[PDB]
């Protein structure tokens, strides 16, 4: 084996699995998902004695059951339910990489409301709703609301988090440290507008979000990670196993 030496030993046989996923979305003003997909990778961190023969099993029939459009593996994976079999490198390594498009959990719903006031003001209300287990917290949430070029100033009211008008970037950035699943939040903003060439209207860019959630938006779940070492005297249940899910936004836009 060119990726793993042979005399490795550890008193504490332990492994760490990381399900990293980027969830991307393009949503219309009328709530239709124009486009959506997830890109994930499973990173394994393992400190196992010998030359262990592991079995990675996830919810792949295609309750809990998800479809994988495509995917790639680490050379150690022996290709041919039918699950992943390998003798992993020691330390950290990327076990697999995959994409998903079907039955994707969109962690956040963005509901925008814009109202024009003559030519001097824009009235914006943006509501964000978290679509996930209430015991789970989203972290690092950011809502980005674009403002027109002719913005002379911005007033915002937000009961949760902090928001800043960014002239330079032409946008209102609302930041929230954490937010529990199944919740609602809103931001109100009054955009003060300068005179402008009447003829050219404003092409309103989408409202975009940044967030990090503790579950895989694709719905993927680790079932088991079976360790077998025929020579050495530790069995699968001697192994200490941990899994973590870090789902993060990729492109996540809401057309207003």
């Amino acid at each position: 084996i060119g990726w793993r030496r042979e005399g490795i030993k550890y008193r504490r046989n332990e492994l760490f699995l990381d399900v990293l996923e980027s969830v991307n979305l393009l949503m219309s003003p009328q709530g239709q998902v124009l486009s959506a997909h997830v890109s994930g990778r499973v990173v394994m961190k393992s400190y196992l004695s010998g030359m262990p023969e592991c079995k990675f099993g996830m919810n792949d029939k295609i309750k809990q059951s998800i479809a994988i459009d495509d995917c790639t593996f680490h050379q150690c994976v022996r290709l041919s339910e039918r699950s992943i079999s390998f003798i992993p490198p020691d330390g950290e390594f990327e076990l697999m990489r995959y994409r998903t498009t079907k039955d994707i959990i969109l962690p956040f719903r963005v509901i925008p409301l814009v109202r024009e006031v003559g030519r001097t003001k824009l009235e914006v209300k943006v509501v964000i709703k978290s679509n996930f287990k209430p015991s789970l917290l989203a972290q690092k949430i950011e809502v980005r609301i674009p403002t027109p070029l002719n913005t002379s100033g911005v007033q915002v009211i937000c009961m949760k988090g902090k928001a800043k008008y960014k002239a330079s970037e032409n946008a209102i950035v609302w930041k929230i440290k954490r937010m529990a699943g199944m919740k609602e939040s809103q931001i109100s903003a009054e955009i003060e507008l300068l005179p402008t060439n009447d003829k050219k209207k404003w092409a309103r860019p989408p409202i975009s979000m940044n967030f990090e959630v503790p579950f895989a938006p694709s719905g993927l779940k680790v079932r088991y990670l079976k360790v077998f070492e025929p020579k050495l005297n530790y069995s699968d249940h001697d192994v200490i196993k941990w899994v973590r899910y870090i789902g993060r936004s990729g492109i996540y836009e809401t057309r207003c």
């Binding site: 760490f16 503790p214 680790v222 990670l225 200490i240 196993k241 941990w242 899994v243 973590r244």
Partner: peptide, 6 residues
Amino acid sequence: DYQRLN
């Protein structure tokens, strides 16, 4: 965060 696998 990390959770014990089954």
